[model samples]
Target chain A: AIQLTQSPSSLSASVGDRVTITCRASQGISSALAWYQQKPGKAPKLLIYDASSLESGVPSRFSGSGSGTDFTLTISSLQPEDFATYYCQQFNSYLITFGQGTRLEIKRTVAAPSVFIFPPSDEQLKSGTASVVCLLNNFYPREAKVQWKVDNALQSGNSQESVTEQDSKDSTYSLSSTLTLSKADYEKHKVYACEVTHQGLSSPVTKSFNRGE
Target chain B: EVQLVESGGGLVQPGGSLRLSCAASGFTFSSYDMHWVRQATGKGLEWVSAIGTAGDTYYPDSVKGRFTISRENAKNSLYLQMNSLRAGDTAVYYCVREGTYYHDSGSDNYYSYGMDVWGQGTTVTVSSASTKGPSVFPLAPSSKSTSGGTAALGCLVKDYFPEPVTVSWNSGALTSGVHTFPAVLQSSGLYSLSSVVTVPSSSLGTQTYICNVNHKPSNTKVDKRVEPS
Candidate 1:
């Protein structure tokens, strides 16, 4: 059996976001592996096998195409209701394996302003503090690697904090990172990108939030 | 239109008696045969035995004394009874209606030979029923990683029934990975076995996961696959 890994192991996507996951074999299992999406505490449902062949009774929105060592798993239209971990399973080589999962998340892109110190304007030169949390209600979550990029440019020296979900069935693997920049620096950086990386995958999944007043 | 469906998981105690069922519904039981197979945790597929609708049965000569198969025509089902259950018996028990939906790609639904129509599968817990024996959790190779990863050639499960556990990785006898020390049992009265590494991911990039029961020792390896993640 070929060794399999996910890109950026762990990923997060907001509601209505389109997501793609690749289950790449070390060499080429040809069209051996089958892709499946597993919800916590349930058996995995076959998604794509023999590269792009859909299994019986699968949702039409979930599609997989491509072959050889490079294959693609695309979720046509991601909905808020479809928040969970998705994994790629290979039955090729008769030895089965699964890729690290890419989690689909839902959040408010623009929150209604309240009485508390609101988010600084995207147009103004202002910076304060912000907290981003990801909650998973299933499976044992390992450590998650964090990456922070500001305004499309890679930020230098971003620190990450690791915290886990207390629930067993829905464990949370979280990473809290602090972005230190002055109001003058805030004008140059309007977006904060958080990317979580892990094993069992081939690429990294990135989540971004806009900071504007 | 034959529909091969299987049912409920079984929990049998070690050194106990087991009467498992592979009940069918869609088609007449007389039209097709049924097979009872076992898959140990972290292990590959094994042919436990099979029975024809007329009470005719076959077994891998080695297990003839330990396992038996019988057809309950009145119930439209097949029954598997294995005596002197061991920790090794703890596996996912599956009932398959054989050669039911075989489709010859070139000939539409016309099947050329005997192929399997598998069920959704049911996991049997040997320890869950008793307080002894091994852990049934599946232990497979680290999801094939690296680049060229590892590709399995094929498992020998193609053999119908009553065959010795003749597993081959690539084309040679399986002598790798964690295996049971047949001569002795573990300190816990259970056997300690593990991943039967047929072809290691580092040395060989491609190989077979064959579960060949000694049925004809033919040239068929059911469920062939190549590694590509």
Candidate 2:
């Protein structure tokens, strides 16, 4: 006699969002599965045991893979006080079953100001093409977007320039993305990604500048 | 009605050690009587043992050698195992029952043993499900019919790791001399895990040839009807 189930019951996130979960074993089980995470007075942190093996000192972006009947858990980056609630357990048999919890919420992302992106100057420009900048002091709700992707495709010519909504809620906004090839394309290797979508979220996030030669 | 209620978790802090259980299933465990008593959470109740019905053994003089009480009447549900758990063993581990063959003499054919019917004490506390490793007092038999002779059917691994584990029985993998013993764990979690499974007795009763139990690679459980009358 064993039973456990949970889904879509509760979940929402901000300050970085990503979520997933599932578990089942009414009969035909000996997987010794386990996965848990709790916040609010503590005591329930064992994120993936026999299912994925990551319980010695977890924290590589909070991840969990699936097996047997089914399983999943991911939390790449969301730490504005990670809200609370998440569980999944079953030691095969002898009475031990649980899966009823998932509650994470936070949504507030306001962007659009002067513009910034610093770090491209340590003086090693033997021949042509090089620029560095990060100075976006103030502006708000306006609009500015420019990207040159590598891991998310869309790469060739890149440039950016824009402005609006400078009517104050105390005004503040910034944006930048540029890469005009050459010098063996930043030699050593090739890496460049930029992302910034709005209305709270969305739009390519590929940030990689490899140095693998 | 198929019912299995278990409880026992606490007190064992001098040297630390405790494990309690009695999770049974379905019906006709010979005819009923699976008792084990002890309570001290709110306090009051003490019996210790009463597992009987055609292969008997009862105890209560402080329940011997760390303890041993067993059962395997082709369980529809089972789990009566006690461990190398101490610390005064703080109580609240119970199971209730009342009769299963107590009419003997004058030609009624019984007394075979005793345990009158019970199930009402579920508590264990020695801090964190009594940890000491090496246990798998295991058993398995979700469903079966039966038709084999000289069989005793048993499986119970009390949290095992390497100690005395590596049991096998098969029909598809070939190798069926399956014979093992150590059925008696009663400090508080009764047991009667039997297995003399030597099939080929005309095999009928759901094709009879099963009585499984494993603690490796995948951990398994199975038990159903025995015939040697």
Candidate 3:
């Protein structure tokens, strides 16, 4: 059987970092080698074929090159979505050998907390109770605590919930939370803040409401 | 059968150097070039180096600067040398030839080039752990009395590391008919090599022959005596 092998089983890198993985065949298979990327539970996606050619719809950031017994797959700029395992397969022989697999892991990095609030206007506030959404997007580690506060005091009787939606293109998670408030409270120009507590936050992500004067 | 054997498997401290060898037999050596492939445990494959019969060599950019691949024509062998090794560089090194074996005439004459034969892998561990050298089996010199023919001796070296071990005869010399098989990989991640020397049956007991195995990683030597039994 044709033999293929790989090195450096796993690596940790951040977004925008460049990384390279290698594959070698036992014979002069030329450019018959292919590379693939596999997410945690998803099927492997072809990234490069015939050595260095990029697959269709694949981002320009991924590239491959080499000939004969040697070849390489390089991610020019690592995206969050690129944090997965990679494999190399040989089509030269029916044995169809594949490198074990190399994992691209995300390095825990300091991420800035971001928050923006969608507050109810005068027309919406007239309905007695209005729904206000606090969008907290692009944060690492899904676990986040969110709360609603008015004039420095935590608001009660208000519903708070968050939905985590991942940006498929980049693999980062976006958490959006909504808090319901009474019109009497919404109508006040008093400060309303959505507080977010998470790692990498010096304190909390506090987004205040202006009441749309 | 056409076979390729690899040796010089051993541990190297980070930033050190490593050298491995592959011997080929049962086929023409200069007919095809051999390539070296390495696989770190649980990782993907890497093409470290390749050498052609015409003295041409190629290395992927990933290993070009640190690896040197060459051939020993007289020995019908290939060698791989790498310096400034890292812990990440520890892996199983394999040598492969690029053609299928045809039985009718016993030639690796397939038209297309793809590694059809592989040597069992020799492990290179770049760590502080104790690295072991190969165990040299007693030399078995074929006897004309037992087989009623020319005297042939087989020297076997096994389970050694820091590889690319070169075996030679230290004491009595043979005038002709000497063949060294390539190093074969043992399941234990060590290597086993055998070479035969044909001399006169009259010189058997009178000569004390020593089989010396030289390891490149640590620049050490291991040998055993072949006495008439």
Which candidate, 1 or 3, would have the higher DockQ against the true structure?
3
Arranged by TM-score, best first: 1, 3, 2
**How well is each residue in B1-229 modelled by candidate 2, as lDDT tens digits?**
5555664443344444445556665566666656565544322233466555654545455544555556666643334455565534555565644332333457644332222234545555443333323322222221232344322232333333211134455533525434344333323332222233333435433444443455332243333223221
Per-residue alpha-carbon lDDT of model 2 for A87-135, expressed as tens digits?
A: 6665454334555556544333465332223323223234343322222
Q: What is the TM-score of chain A alone in each candidate?
A: 0.49, 0.32, 0.53
What's the true lDDT of residue A23 in model 1?
A: 64
Tell me the docking grade of candidate 1: incorrect
DockQ by candidate, in order? 0.01, 0.01, 0.02
Q: For model 2, report DockQ.
A: 0.01
The number of the candidate with the highest TM-score is 1
- lDDT against the true structure, each candidate: 0.47, 0.44, 0.66
The estimated TM-scores of all candidates read 0.36, 0.22, 0.33
**Model 3: lDDT of residue B42:** 40
For model 1, what is the error of residue B188's alpha carbon versus the real structure, in angstroms, after optimal superposition?
Answer: 18
The RMSD (Cα, Å) of candidate 3 is 29.0
**What's the true lDDT of residue A9 in model 2?**
54
Per residue, candidate 1 scores C-alpha lDDT tens digits across B1-229 of: 5444455445566677666767677777777777775655434345567666566776664357888877777777777777877777777676766443233476444321122345555665554322222211111222434445532222212102112123334344565431221111223242222112324456443443433222122222332232322
lDDT of 1 by residue, A31-131 (tens): 55556564433334456555666666677778877666777888777665555566664434423355655654433232211000112222222224232
